[PDB]
Design a protein around this motif. Structure first.
Motif, PDB file in Angstrom:
ATOM      1  N   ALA C 203       0.817  -1.207   0.000  1.00 13.21           N
ATOM      2  CA  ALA C 203       0.000   0.000   0.000  1.00 13.21           C
ATOM      3  C   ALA C 203       0.852   1.258   0.000  1.00 13.21           C
ATOM      4  O   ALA C 203       0.558   2.201  -0.738  1.00 13.21           O
ATOM      5  CB  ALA C 203      -0.926   0.012   1.205  1.00 13.21           C
ATOM      6  N   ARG C 204       1.902   1.302   0.822  1.00 15.30           N
ATOM      7  CA  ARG C 204       2.692   2.526   0.910  1.00 15.30           C
ATOM      8  C   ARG C 204       3.592   2.726  -0.304  1.00 15.30           C
ATOM      9  O   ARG C 204       3.832   3.870  -0.706  1.00 15.30           O
ATOM     10  CB  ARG C 204       3.543   2.515   2.181  1.00 15.30           C
ATOM     11  CG  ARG C 204       2.759   2.530   3.486  1.00 15.30           C
ATOM     12  CD  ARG C 204       1.911   3.775   3.657  1.00 15.30           C
ATOM     13  NE  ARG C 204       2.685   5.003   3.534  1.00 15.30           N
ATOM     14  CZ  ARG C 204       3.357   5.584   4.520  1.00 15.30           C
ATOM     15  NH1 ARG C 204       3.381   5.073   5.739  1.00 15.30           N
ATOM     16  NH2 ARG C 204       4.016   6.711   4.278  1.00 15.30           N
ATOM     17  N   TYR C 242       6.644   1.590   7.561  1.00 14.91           N
ATOM     18  CA  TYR C 242       5.712   1.114   8.573  1.00 14.91           C
ATOM     19  C   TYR C 242       5.282   2.230   9.515  1.00 14.91           C
ATOM     20  O   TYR C 242       4.091   2.359   9.809  1.00 14.91           O
ATOM     21  CB  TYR C 242       6.325  -0.045   9.346  1.00 14.91           C
ATOM     22  CG  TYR C 242       6.196  -1.347   8.608  1.00 14.91           C
ATOM     23  CD1 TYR C 242       6.779  -1.519   7.372  1.00 14.91           C
ATOM     24  CD2 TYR C 242       5.475  -2.396   9.134  1.00 14.91           C
ATOM     25  CE1 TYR C 242       6.663  -2.697   6.692  1.00 14.91           C
ATOM     26  CE2 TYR C 242       5.354  -3.582   8.457  1.00 14.91           C
ATOM     27  CZ  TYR C 242       5.948  -3.725   7.235  1.00 14.91           C
ATOM     28  OH  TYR C 242       5.833  -4.907   6.551  1.00 14.91           O
ATOM     29  N   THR C 243       6.216   3.066   9.971  1.00 14.76           N
ATOM     30  CA  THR C 243       5.908   4.069  10.982  1.00 14.76           C
ATOM     31  C   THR C 243       5.668   5.458  10.409  1.00 14.76           C
ATOM     32  O   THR C 243       5.054   6.288  11.084  1.00 14.76           O
ATOM     33  CB  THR C 243       7.048   4.150  12.008  1.00 14.76           C
ATOM     34  OG1 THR C 243       7.394   2.830  12.445  1.00 14.76           O
ATOM     35  CG2 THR C 243       6.637   4.975  13.221  1.00 14.76           C
ATOM     36  N   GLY C 244       6.129   5.737   9.196  1.00 12.42           N
ATOM     37  CA  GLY C 244       6.034   7.074   8.660  1.00 12.42           C
ATOM     38  C   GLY C 244       7.053   8.047   9.206  1.00 12.42           C
ATOM     39  O   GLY C 244       6.989   9.234   8.866  1.00 12.42           O
ATOM     40  N   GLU C 266       7.410   8.944  -2.283  1.00  8.99           N
ATOM     41  CA  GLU C 266       7.435  10.369  -2.568  1.00  8.99           C
ATOM     42  C   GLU C 266       7.262  11.216  -1.305  1.00  8.99           C
ATOM     43  O   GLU C 266       6.957  12.408  -1.398  1.00  8.99           O
ATOM     44  CB  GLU C 266       6.366  10.691  -3.621  1.00  8.99           C
ATOM     45  CG  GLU C 266       6.399  12.096  -4.246  1.00  8.99           C
ATOM     46  CD  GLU C 266       7.703  12.387  -4.965  1.00  8.99           C
ATOM     47  OE1 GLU C 266       8.363  11.426  -5.417  1.00  8.99           O
ATOM     48  OE2 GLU C 266       8.074  13.574  -5.070  1.00  8.99           O
ATOM     49  N   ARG C 267       7.469  10.633  -0.127  1.00 12.65           N
ATOM     50  CA  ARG C 267       7.611  11.385   1.113  1.00 12.65           C
ATOM     51  C   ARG C 267       9.007  11.251   1.699  1.00 12.65           C
ATOM     52  O   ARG C 267       9.617  12.252   2.075  1.00 12.65           O
ATOM     53  CB  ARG C 267       6.567  10.925   2.135  1.00 12.65           C
ATOM     54  CG  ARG C 267       6.646  11.656   3.464  1.00 12.65           C
ATOM     55  CD  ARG C 267       5.448  11.362   4.343  1.00 12.65           C
ATOM     56  NE  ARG C 267       5.349  12.302   5.453  1.00 12.65           N
ATOM     57  CZ  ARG C 267       6.131  12.293   6.525  1.00 12.65           C
ATOM     58  NH1 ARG C 267       7.115  11.418   6.663  1.00 12.65           N
ATOM     59  NH2 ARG C 267       5.925  13.190   7.484  1.00 12.65           N
ATOM     60  N   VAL C 270      11.315  13.252  -0.533  1.00 14.04           N
ATOM     61  CA  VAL C 270      11.322  14.684  -0.257  1.00 14.04           C
ATOM     62  C   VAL C 270      11.978  14.976   1.087  1.00 14.04           C
ATOM     63  O   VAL C 270      12.597  16.029   1.263  1.00 14.04           O
ATOM     64  CB  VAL C 270       9.892  15.246  -0.321  1.00 14.04           C
ATOM     65  CG1 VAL C 270       9.878  16.698   0.120  1.00 14.04           C
ATOM     66  CG2 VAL C 270       9.339  15.116  -1.732  1.00 14.04           C
ATOM     67  N   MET C 271      11.857  14.067   2.056  1.00 16.22           N
ATOM     68  CA  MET C 271      12.519  14.277   3.341  1.00 16.22           C
ATOM     69  C   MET C 271      14.036  14.172   3.206  1.00 16.22           C
ATOM     70  O   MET C 271      14.776  14.950   3.820  1.00 16.22           O
ATOM     71  CB  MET C 271      11.997  13.277   4.370  1.00 16.22           C
ATOM     72  CG  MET C 271      10.878  13.826   5.233  1.00 16.22           C
ATOM     73  SD  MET C 271       9.911  12.541   6.045  1.00 16.22           S
ATOM     74  CE  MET C 271      11.202  11.575   6.812  1.00 16.22           C
ATOM     75  N   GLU C 273      15.575  14.930   0.483  1.00 13.25           N
ATOM     76  CA  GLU C 273      15.902  16.195  -0.169  1.00 13.25           C
ATOM     77  C   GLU C 273      16.007  17.324   0.848  1.00 13.25           C
ATOM     78  O   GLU C 273      16.909  18.163   0.766  1.00 13.25           O
ATOM     79  CB  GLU C 273      14.852  16.527  -1.225  1.00 13.25           C
ATOM     80  CG  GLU C 273      14.947  15.677  -2.471  1.00 13.25           C
ATOM     81  CD  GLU C 273      13.817  15.946  -3.434  1.00 13.25           C
ATOM     82  OE1 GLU C 273      13.569  17.130  -3.739  1.00 13.25           O
ATOM     83  OE2 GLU C 273      13.179  14.976  -3.891  1.00 13.25           O
ATOM     84  N   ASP C 274      15.084  17.362   1.809  1.00 17.22           N
ATOM     85  CA  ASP C 274      15.139  18.376   2.857  1.00 17.22           C
ATOM     86  C   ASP C 274      16.419  18.257   3.674  1.00 17.22           C
ATOM     87  O   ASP C 274      17.041  19.268   4.018  1.00 17.22           O
ATOM     88  CB  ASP C 274      13.917  18.252   3.765  1.00 17.22           C
ATOM     89  CG  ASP C 274      13.749  19.440   4.691  1.00 17.22           C
ATOM     90  OD1 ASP C 274      14.601  20.352   4.661  1.00 17.22           O
ATOM     91  OD2 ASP C 274      12.759  19.463   5.452  1.00 17.22           O
ATOM     92  N   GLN C 299      12.879  19.709  -6.171  1.00 18.05           N
ATOM     93  CA  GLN C 299      13.189  20.755  -5.201  1.00 18.05           C
ATOM     94  C   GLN C 299      14.684  20.820  -4.924  1.00 18.05           C
ATOM     95  O   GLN C 299      15.274  21.909  -4.906  1.00 18.05           O
ATOM     96  CB  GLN C 299      12.418  20.510  -3.904  1.00 18.05           C
ATOM     97  CG  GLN C 299      10.927  20.271  -4.094  1.00 18.05           C
ATOM     98  CD  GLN C 299      10.135  20.458  -2.816  1.00 18.05           C
ATOM     99  OE1 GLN C 299      10.473  19.898  -1.776  1.00 18.05           O
ATOM    100  NE2 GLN C 299       9.066  21.240  -2.893  1.00 18.05           N
TER     101      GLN C 299
END
Lengths: 349, 45, 347
Positions: C203-204, C242-244, C266-267, C270-271, C273-274, C299
């Motif tokens: 799913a993720r 699993y935890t985000g 895609e989270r 980006v993290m 990248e940050d 970005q």
């Protein structure tokens, strides 16, 4: 205009506010003469036990200046020595709980143990003695005080920024809902009174201890695919299993009566507490008996305590309601427990 | 007797007589509660 | 509003009495120097003793005019005893007034008797028009109100709504990742044989959904193989899925960005990248720009382009810029285009 522009400094001042209501029965009955003191029991803010305040009022205000005027003070009992300072206000209430007379200090005063700052020469006593004033209902002087201790002296360095990239939120809540509506190739089949639902084992076992004990013990060998949950209606089972997956229940306040039973049945503690929150806010005199029965049968604690407190306040008219008669005939020990709770509240008479 | 048990409630509830009345005679406890609440209060909070 | 009541109910002991002298109209004989009364009590087991001695005749100089009604303490252990009393008449005929009182009180100590001697002029009381001698008798009424002051109620006045424990979905899925309960597949990375689920993974991570939903379950789910990411970065990535949460993101931004981009997270991408954005020194911007372009980050690539446009004065000296020019002409061209229509078009 140039919005944002680098920093977001948010220097904070620590302020703690608490109230203290004082009620002396048959105020100007005796109360002794001349100097005297009516030092009350010490009270703290409530946030931990470190600072100990206490009022002390002289109906015959000391010194010649306050023979004719009532005098009031406020004292520090004991606290870890830091020379705390505060601003305080006093007010006299009536039987209706309306702020009739209120006196508020203009400046914060410097408090240390043994030294008291207060509204010395507080008020014309004769104005209070006037029975036509109505400010002494049943000869009981009610005094209301708020203390506004400010501890201050904390500065944050803001948020310097210089790094502008947005990480988009957190979709773990939503993208487990995607395992439910789309149903995404589950592993075991539930059943709500014949109806068919599909659901996994990892998330259920993780978030619902009774389910975990159900799936592994005597179940993983024989009936691993099929289980029948034949004790709840599907219209609320869907909400329970849109809580277990997504971690939130939208349609809760509409159907909080049985969702508490379902949540407590499977030991979903967070949903049980959320259902208690929804039920606790809908308390009324016409159904406090039903809420107390439900909060005791399903082993709720916070809801039981708050329903007992509500019935203690509003026993004036609950007694007429058919719910109370039903609970009396059917559930004696709840009546006995409500009585025991009322014993402490109305103890001194 | 109801007024007495209201005034000495803090001690009476420890007795065996009350603990048997709560089981055998519930509406007596209902009367005691009525004469404790409806016949008294308000008291601060 | 309220947070702590302190009722401190003052203790009240009210008790009453009367004094029915039957022949007051001719109690002149005996000479009423003192009518020594009989003791009376009340309250707790008759612990307090009182009596109402009357001097109807003229014991003192002015006593010939005004009658006396004087209280007396027979016995009491505690010396300090205040008592605010209200002497009066129990209305045998129709009369209740004329009975004033001492609103102030003094100390009734053992043996002492404080009271008063000036009550009522003789003739007015003896006049029958006032009706103060009903049937030759008259009655008295003292509401001696004694008090002792040691009382304080504490009170708590607690009020609060039900606190809700915080959403523990992320924490409990993490605890599932560690505990590995009801596991359904076995991940492999560089010899390590990890164990993980299918539902939350697929799913993720859409690229994971690619190699589960294609009827490739029995063949691959038992022994799915991954060979690119090193074990630590992969374990951090799994903790993210699993935890985000990515706790130790900062120290492995590069390879973790590669891992995030490989599986289209895609989270975490980006993290990473940050995290890389706040590491842009003037000498590492070359490899950062290579990485941002290579893994299809927008970005980070834009920010690295801006940074190199700002700090080119030193970057061309560094070996990284020479490497980019030699190997990656397109990146140099894109930086040139970015610098073209911005940040210098004034000359």
């Amino acid at each position: 205009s140039g919005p944002v522009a680098e920093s977001w400094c948010y220097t904070q001042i620590k302020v703690v506010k608490f109230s203290y209501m004082w009620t002396i029965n048959n105020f100007s009955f005796c109360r002794e003469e001349m100097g005297e003191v009516i030092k009350s029991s010490t009270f703290s803010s409530g946030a931990n036990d470190k600072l100990k305040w206490c009022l002390r009022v002289n109906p015959k205000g000391l010194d010649e200046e306050s023979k004719d005027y009532l005098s009031l003070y406020l004292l520090l009992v004991s606290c870890p020595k830091s020379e705390v300072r505060a601003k305080f206000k006093f007010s006299i209430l009536n039987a209706k709980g309306e702020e009739t007379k209120a006196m508020e200090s203009q400046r914060a005063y410097r408090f240390v143990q043994g030294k008291d700052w207060g509204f010395k020469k507080f008020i014309r006593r004769d104005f209070l003695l006037d029975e036509a004033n109505g400010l002494l209902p049943d000869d009981k002087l009610t005094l209301f005080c708020e203390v506004s201790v400010v501890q201050d002296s904390v500065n944050i360095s803001g948020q310097n920024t210089m790094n502008m990239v947005k990480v988009p939120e957190c979709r773990l809540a939503d993208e487990l809902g995607g395992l439910w509506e789309n149903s995404r190739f589950t592993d075991c089949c539930l059943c709500v009174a014949g109806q068919e639902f599909q659901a996994h084992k990892a998330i259920l076992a993780a978030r619902s201890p009774v389910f975990s004990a159900m799936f592994e013990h005597e179940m993983e060998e024989s009936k691993k695919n099929r289980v029948e949950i034949n004790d709840v209606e599907p219209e609320v089972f869907k909400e329970m299993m849109c809580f277990i997956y997504t971690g939130k229940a939208p349609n809760l306040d509409k159907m909080a009566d049985d969702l508490l039973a379902a949540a407590d049945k499977y030991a979903l503690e967070r949903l049980k507490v959320m259902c208690e929150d929804a039920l606790c806010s809908n308390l009324s005199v016409e159904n406090a008996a039903e809420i107390l029965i439900l909060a005791d049968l399903h082993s709720a604690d916070q809801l039981k305590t708050q329903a007992v407190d509500f019935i203690n306040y509003h026993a004036s008219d609950v007694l007429e309601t058919s719910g109370w008669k039903s609970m009396v005939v059917s559930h004696p020990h709840l009546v006995a427990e409500a009585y025991r709770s009322l014993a402490s509240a109305q103890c001194p008479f | 007797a109801v007024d007495f048990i209201n005034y000495h409630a803090s001690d009476v509830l420890e007795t065996s007589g009350w603990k048997s009345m709560v089981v055998s005679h519930p509406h007596l406890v209902a009367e005691a509660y009525r004469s404790l609440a409806s016949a008294q209060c308000p008291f601060l909070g």
